Amino acid sequence: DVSFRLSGADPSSYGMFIKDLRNALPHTEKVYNIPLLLPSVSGAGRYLLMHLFNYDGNTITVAVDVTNVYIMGYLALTTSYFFNEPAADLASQYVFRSARRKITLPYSGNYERLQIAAGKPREKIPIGLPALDTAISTLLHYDSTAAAGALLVLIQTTAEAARFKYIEQQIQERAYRDEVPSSATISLENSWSGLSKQIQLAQGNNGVFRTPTVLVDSKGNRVQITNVTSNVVTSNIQLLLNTKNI
Ligand SMILES: *[C@@H]1O[C@H](CO)[C@@H](O)[C@H](O)[C@H]1NC(C)=O
Numbered sequence: 315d316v317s318f319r320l321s322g323a324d325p326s327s328y329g330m331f332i333k334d335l336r337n338a339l340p341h342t343e344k345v346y347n348i349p350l351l352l353p354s355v356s357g358a359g360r361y362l363l364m365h366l367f368n369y370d371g372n373t374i375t376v377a378v379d380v381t382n383v384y385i386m387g388y389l390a391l392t393t394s395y396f397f398n399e400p401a402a403d404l405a406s407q408y409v410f411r412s413a414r415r416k417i418t419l420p421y422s423g424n425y426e427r428l429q430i431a432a433g434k435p436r437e438k439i440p441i442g443l444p445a446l447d448t449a450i451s452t453l454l455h456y457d458s459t460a461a462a463g464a465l466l467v468l469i470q471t472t473a474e475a476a477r478f479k480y481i482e483q484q485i486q487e488r489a490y491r492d493e494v495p496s497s498a499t500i501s502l503e504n505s506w507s508g509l510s511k512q513i514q515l516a517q518g519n520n521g522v523f524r525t526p527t528v529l530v531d532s533k534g535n536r537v538q539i540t541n542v543t544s545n546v547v548t549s550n551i552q553l554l555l556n557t558k559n560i
């Protein structure tokens with residue numbers, strides 16, 4: 315299990331937390347020096363528990379699927395909460411068994427459904443470490459509309475940061491002041507699966523992508539990614555979704 319304390323947090327300690335989160339995910343191989351997440355893990359080993367603590371020291375524990383870095387659910391005091399989706403339902407067989415009750419949220423965990431439930435897209439929800447403190451505080455007492463927005467923050471500050479160094483750095487820039495995500499950040503979040511697939515396919519195509527991935531860059535410009543020499547592959551992406559799940 316991995317942990318993070320907002321009390322005393324700084325860019326360096328968040329950086330270390332994201333490094334621990336990445337190093338908690340198992341892999342048997344690397345593809346262009348990037349950890350390749352496992353196609354499958356059976357039973358309880360499929361789930362990592364992230365313990366998050368707000369400024370005041372209250373905690374939630376988040377269950378994360380180690381094969382895709384998807385948040386399945388979380389535990390706040392004695393109540394467990396899971397997305398309304400089969401994967402999460404399964405995960406509820408293995409984690410937080412001791413919760414006094416289990417609530418299924420009224421939405422699945424994908425960004426489209428969360429944005430609907432929250433009533434606004436990601437583009438307009440500020441993220442950062444203070445947003446993450448708020449999110450943990452929100453998740454402590456059930457409120458489904460507010461939780462949707464908290465979950466969008468949680469996702470992007472934990473899973474998306476683990477996936478991409480550029481997003482980790484965005485959050486480090488927002489250690490003491492929230493700000494809406496950059497376009498580039500949204501683009502990468504949306505392209506993870508596609509990037510992962512093409513990087514895997516490039517191994518057998520001399521590092522060349524079968525189909526190029528279009529992204530938005532640091533500057534706000536459309537850019538086309540065609541091979542593993544791109545900075546997105548050499549520097550940015552940190553974990554690959556196994557094509558066995560694409
Ligand atoms: C590989 O990608 C780099 C960076 O995007 C680019 O300059 C180059 O033209 C690409 N090479 C090939 C063979 O497509």
Ligand SMILES: OCCN(CCO)CCO
Pocket residue numbers: 383384385386397399402422423424425469473474
């Ligand atoms: O259950 C899906 C949860 N998942 C959705 C991603 O858009 C969050 C984890 O990164």
